Nucleic acid binder design. Structure first.
Lengths: 80, 82, 123, 150, 205, 129
RNA sequence: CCCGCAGAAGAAGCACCGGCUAACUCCGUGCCAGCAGCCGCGGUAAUACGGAGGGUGCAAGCGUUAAUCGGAAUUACUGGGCGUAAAGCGCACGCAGGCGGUUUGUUAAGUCAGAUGUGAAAUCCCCGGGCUCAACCUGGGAACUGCAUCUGAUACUGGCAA
RNA sequence: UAGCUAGUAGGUGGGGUAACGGCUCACCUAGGCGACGAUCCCUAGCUGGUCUGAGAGGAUGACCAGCCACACUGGAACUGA
């Protein structure tokens, strides 16, 4: 299959694009504590179906603008 | 061009050559794709002096690799067994 | 101490700077010895301690102790400063290498001879 | 087969009416060479009387240690006053490599090849007291299996 | 790079016969052993703990004729080898070629054996070895060449080989003047009085 | 508030051994009965008994060999502030094998010997020495 | 590299000796000259200064200086503390954060197990081999504690539902 | 050093490149980054490794090898795979 990620929409307001925060849960190298850690990504969506506060899966593609090398596959869990 | 060639690694007045597969425009003792055998011109009169992986050499010559005069001489020395 | 508090702000021991700003941390430097002095020590000791004041080659003007019994330094006398504190004098941080550029070896010495710049007597 | 050795002698003082008065304290450890370790303090006005009181107190007040073949069994930590002490059996980890005043008690204790590292304070009067406490609460595989059934 | 001095002085600081002058006569008789290692030698030392460890290391080096960087390298090799580091260290000191030439009775002392080894009078396995610290493997044959065979020294040395204890890990045979280092010496096969835990602990501080 | 009931259980057992207490009661859970079954199995407690219907109460009958107490030192390793997950190679032995370390592996709550034999590591709960 | 020649013949210094720290006396100096890494020596009998005799440690080196780590558990993750030694905010409310009672079901993100790809070669480590040995060179392995993907396990933690 | 950013963030279309792309231009939207530390300032080639350490770490990155950058200083292209 393809490698994909899941994350939540952190903001919405851009012209056929979105930005998604990813939560990786990584152990501290010295201290041995599992710490949450984000990764904000500028993600493309044609016809901008996902709004703010959603949860969306996301795959990597060719560059579509500056940063923006990521595009959604499936919007889940939109509940407001 | 990729070349199966020798690369000098022993001490002073005592060379040990390792036969590698390098992009030919690298340095001699520099970057190689894979090493594929060795050649000690002394070693002693014991057992080997030279072993050399003929399957990988045949693979690279199948790919288009060239072979220097020493490596050709060593393959002409270790023909199939001797 | 709580592991969260160290994730927020890690441990940090200070730098523990150098006693000898002979800059770059070079083993010796050379200087010009702007003047030559004798200086009285701190309280439990009493002597007159033979000490020069030196314009180094890196710009720093530092004062420097002169080891051994009797020297031949006078005011221009390019010397090779070494590094090493004399605790008994307030503010000398360096020594002069005896047996170096314009600093002769100690006259009539026989033991610990290498650290005073004196050659082996022929016998 | 008694194997006595002295660790520390000191000069303490008292400060009476007319000047000071100086006394000497020994600190010795005896032990047979197979468990059986004791320490004694002892203090007197001259040094040989001090060491003799120390030996005489150390020959009594002697404790059993459950040694292994020639060494400890499991790593053990003994603490006394300000003096924290680690030991590790070092299964033929050759030679007794301990701090001062711990080398002696481990030497006459009959152990041969442990690894130590005292921490904290390392006053000799309290670093033994932290080796015996230590070697005292170190128990053997026939004692743990005695406790917990098997 | 080697000692070159008064030998019995070194044997007199240690308090023990270091076998440094084995030679013609019997037990010392002109050493004043124990009495005075220098001018204040009549004084008892009251030696420290560092002093006993140090003095044990010096006993062993002054026996086998090794200096400190070489000895220290033997301690590193004995440490990394599997087993008991004291026993490994004595096994490394006993495999030295000058030592094996001394044990076989080819030299009267270890310095004389070291000069036999040094002056190309000794072959191992039919090849001449010039080096005092060559490490003799088990099942080797070390012998004297045709030059420096039937020279007086070695004969006299074999004469005083019978006065000593005939080591178990050798094939001493003096007829052909060749020997076989058969196995590594066990710790229980040598000397019984050196305390190698003291030199393990000396280097491990 | 209570945020580590396992360390609370081990605290009950340390302070029961230290007070020559005959038996120790506490609120019960699946993990505490799993650990308690490991402790009875390895010989550090005498018995356990879970009673109650709507509020279960685990009860550990403690052991005392001589006058001394059997549980010499019980420690909590994987606390909630910092959890400790060891592999089958990193999996420690306590008092050089004379003292078990209760590891929660995927196959269940086991000891260090039993889970190193089973070929799988996990979350190391407590050292019992 | 081998053989032959002549003759011990061409071939030993450097630091230290009060304690720490292995190794001691005499003479000169007399708060001076000077020593010193710290403690500190020297104001007339100085094992601390300068010399000598003696000894100790290293050795074609030996000392000093500079720099790093160690010792230093004196930044403590392993592995420290906070009544009085330095250290509990003057006290609360509370957002983000950290942590979260108990039972069942599902997931399997953390966690664990296995597999695959990769983690260059040299270097470190192990077992061998060649230079008379050693340093050195070298064969094979281990290792590179990682990351990614796939396959599973589901006790604990997390997500979801009750 | 708490705000930084207007080709700036995104979109549509044209151009450009070997190739995606604000790479460039016109128009439209008003975004984007930031206390998980942006922006500014000081320092610095990076790594395999080296030194020390029981270890975890700490320091460092001379030789050897991989990558980057530079070629008196600042800029530009031409030829050419």
């Amino acid at each position: 299959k393809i490698r994909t990620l899941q994350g939540r929409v952190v903001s919405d307001k851009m012209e056929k694009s979105i930005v998604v925060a990813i939560e990786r849960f990584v152990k501290h190298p010295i201290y041995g504590k599992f710490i949450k850690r984000t990764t904000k990504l500028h993600v493309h969506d044609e016809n901008n179906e996902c709004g703010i506060g959603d949860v969306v899966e996301i795959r990597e593609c060719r560059p579509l603008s500056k940063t923006k090398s990521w595009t959604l596959v499936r919007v889940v869990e939109k509940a407001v | 061009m990729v070349t199966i060639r020798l690369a000098r690694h022993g001490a002073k007045k005592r060379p040990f050559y390792q036969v590698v597969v390098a992009d030919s425009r690298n340095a001699r003792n520099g970057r190689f794709i894979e090493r594929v055998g060795f050649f000690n011109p002394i070693a002693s009169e014991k057992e080997e002096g030279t072993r050399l992986d003929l399957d990988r050499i045949a693979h690279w010559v199948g790919q288009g690799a060239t072979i220097s005069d020493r490596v050709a001489a060593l393959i002409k020395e270790v023909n199939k067994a001797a | 101490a709580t592991v969260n508090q160290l994730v927020r702000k890690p441990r940090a021991r200070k730098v523990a700077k150098s006693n000898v700003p002979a800059l770059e941390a070079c083993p010796q430097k050379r200087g010009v010895c702007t003047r030559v002095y004798t200086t009285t020590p701190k309280k439990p000791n009493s002597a007159l301690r033979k000490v020069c004041r030196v314009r180094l080659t890196n710009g720093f003007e530092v004062t420097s102790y002169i080891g051994g019994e009797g020297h031949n330094l006078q005011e221009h006398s390019v010397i090779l400063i070494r590094g090493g504190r004399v605790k008994d004098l307030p503010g000398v941080r360096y020594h002069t290498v005896r047996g170096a550029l314009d600093c002769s070896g100690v006259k009539d010495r026989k033991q610990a001879r290498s650290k005073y710049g004196v050659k082996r007597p022929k016998a | 087969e008694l194997q006595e050795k002295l660790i520390a002698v000191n000069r303490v003082s008292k400060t009476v009416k007319g000047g000071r008065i100086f006394s000497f304290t020994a600190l010795t450890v005896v032990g047979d060479g197979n468990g059986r370790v004791g320490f004694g303090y002892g203090k007197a006005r001259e040094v040989p009387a001090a060491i003799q009181k120390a030996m005489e107190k150390a020959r009594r007040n002697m404790i059993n240690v459950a040694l292994n073949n020639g060494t400890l069994q499991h790593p053990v930590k003994g603490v006394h006053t300000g003096s924290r002490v680690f030991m590790q059996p070092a299964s033929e980890g050759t030679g007794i490599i301990a701090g001062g005043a711990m080398r002696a008690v481990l030497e006459v204790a009959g152990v041969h090849n442990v690894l130590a590292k005292a921490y904290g304070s390392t006053n000799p009067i309290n670093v033994v007291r932290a080796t015996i406490d230590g070697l005292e609460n170190m128990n053997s595989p026939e004692m743990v299996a005695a406790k917990r059934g098997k | 790079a080697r000692y070159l001095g008064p030998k019995l002085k070194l044997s007199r600081r240690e308090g023990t016969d270091l076998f440094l002058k084995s030679g013609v006569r019997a037990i010392d008789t002109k050493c004043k052993i124990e009495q005075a290692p220098g001018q204040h030698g009549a004084r008892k030392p009251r030696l420290s703990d560092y002093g006993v460890q140090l003095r044990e290391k010096q006993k062993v080096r002054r026996i086998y004729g090794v200096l400190e960087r070489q000895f220290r390298n033997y301690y590193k090799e004995a440490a990394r080898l599997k087993g008991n580091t004291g026993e490994n260290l004595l096994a490394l000191l006993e495999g030295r070629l000058d030592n094996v030439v001394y044990r076989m009775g080819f030299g009267a002392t270890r310095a004389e054996a070291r000069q036999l080894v040094s002056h190309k009078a000794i072959m191992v396995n039919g090849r001449v070895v010039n080096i005092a610290s060559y490490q003799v493997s088990p099942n080797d044959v070390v012998s004297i060449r045709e030059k420096a065979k039937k020279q007086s020294r070695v004969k006299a040395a074999l004469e005083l080989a019978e006065q000593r204890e005939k080591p178990t890990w050798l094939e001493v045979d003096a007829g052909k003047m060749e020997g076989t280092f058969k196995r590594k010496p066990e710790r229980s096969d040598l000397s019984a009085d050196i305390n190698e835990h003291l030199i393990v602990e000396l280097y491990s501080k | 508030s209570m945020q580590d009931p396992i360390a609370d259980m081990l605290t009950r057992i340390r302070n029961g051994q230290a007070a020559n207490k005959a038996a120790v009661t506490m609120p019960s859970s699946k993990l505490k009965v799993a650990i308690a079954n490991v402790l009875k199995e390895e010989g550090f407690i005498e018995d356990f008994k879970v009673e109650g219907d709507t509020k279960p109460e685990l009860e550990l009958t403690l052991k005392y060999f001589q006058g001394k107490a059997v549980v010499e030192s019980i420690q909590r390793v994987s606390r909630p502030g910092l959890r400790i997950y060891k592999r089958k190679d990193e999996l420690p032995k306590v008092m050089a094998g004379l003292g078990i370390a209760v590891v929660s592996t995927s196959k269940g709550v086991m000891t260090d010997r039993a889970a190193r034999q089973a070929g799988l590591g996990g979350e190391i709960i407590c050292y019992v020495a």
